[PDB]
């Protein structure tokens, strides 16, 4: 495609496999995943299942503004911050900066996709991409802004959307 990258769940799985394999190759097995809410939710859960990482914590950030930090002490822990895309890099910057104030043993970052203009390059990523990424978990947000985007099941979504608006 030319404007959009619309990864299948199959590709999302392979992105996570790719980051997992790179973590193992680097010998960086995090003690704690910090999922960036809410784009990093699904990548962090899949990565957790893949590598059997039992400790996931969360930071609610909107873009960046912190709304909440859901974690206990990280002192002396190896942390991996997980997001779905690093576009401007501002989110990873803000999250790295605040997590560093918890004095972890180490902070590394991971994002499934990287834009070529990001001010922060994740330690781990699957693909650098210069198109707008429509993820399986924000496809309806994208459709609500632009109905033309070429995603599956749009008809069923649009029927539901119309019923919602009637409320």
Look at residue 68 and give the partner it binds from a second copy, ligand 4UO, none, a contact being a CB closer than 5 to 8 Å depending on partner kind.
a second copy
Is the Cβ of residue 36 or residue 94 nearer to a second copy in the bound state? 94
Pair 92, 64: CB distance under 8 Å: no
Report d(CA 120, CA 4) in Å as an integer: 22
Pair 5, 131: CB distance under 8 Å: yes
Report d(CA 37, CA 60) in Å as an integer: 5
Q: Is the dihedral of CA 53, 95, 23, 8 positive or negative?
A: positive
The single residue among 37, 41, 50, 69 that binds a second copy, judged by CB under 8 A, is 69
Is the Cβ of residue 76 or residue 150 nearer to a second copy in the bound state? 76
- Residue numbers in the known binding site are 83-84, 87-89, 91, 115, 132-133, 138
Measured between alpha carbons, how far apart are the two ends of the chain, in Å? 36
The single residue among 87, 99, 109, 118 that binds ligand 4UO, judged by CB under 6 A, is 87
Site string for ligand 4UO, 60-79 (x = CB under 6 A): --xx----------------
* Among candidate residues 4, 5, 9, the one with its CA nearest the CA of residue 137: 9
Element (H, E) at 17: helix 9-25
- Residue numbers in the known binding site for GMP are 83-84, 87-89, 91, 115, 132-133, 138
Residue 145 found at the interface with a second copy (CB under 8 A): no
Is the Cβ of residue 9 or residue 70 nearer to a second copy in the bound state? 70
Binding site for ligand 4UO (CB under 6 A): 39, 62-63, 83-85, 87, 91, 132-135, 138, 142
């Amino acid at each position: 495609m030319v404007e959009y990258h619309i990864p299948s769940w199959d590709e999302i799985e392979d992105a996570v496999f790719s980051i997992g394999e790179a973590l193992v190759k680097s010998n960086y097995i995090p003690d704690v995943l910090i999922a960036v809410l809410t784009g990093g939710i699904i990548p962090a859960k899949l990565l957790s299942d893949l590598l059997d990482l039992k400790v996931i914590r969360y930071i609610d950030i909107k873009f960046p503004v912190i709304r909440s930090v859901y974690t206990d002490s990280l002192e002396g822990k190896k942390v991996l911050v997980v997001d779905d895309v690093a576009d401007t890099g501002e989110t990873l910057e803000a999250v790295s900066n605040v997590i560093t104030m918890f004095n972890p043993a180490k902070v590394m970052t991971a994002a499934l996709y990287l834009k070529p203009w990001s001010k922060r390059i994740p330690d781990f990523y699957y693909k650098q991409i210069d198109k707008w990424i429509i993820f399986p978990w924000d496809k309806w947000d994208v459709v609500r802004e632009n109905s033309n985007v070429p995603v599956d099941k749009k008809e069923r979504f649009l029927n539901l959307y119309n019923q919602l608006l009637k409320i």
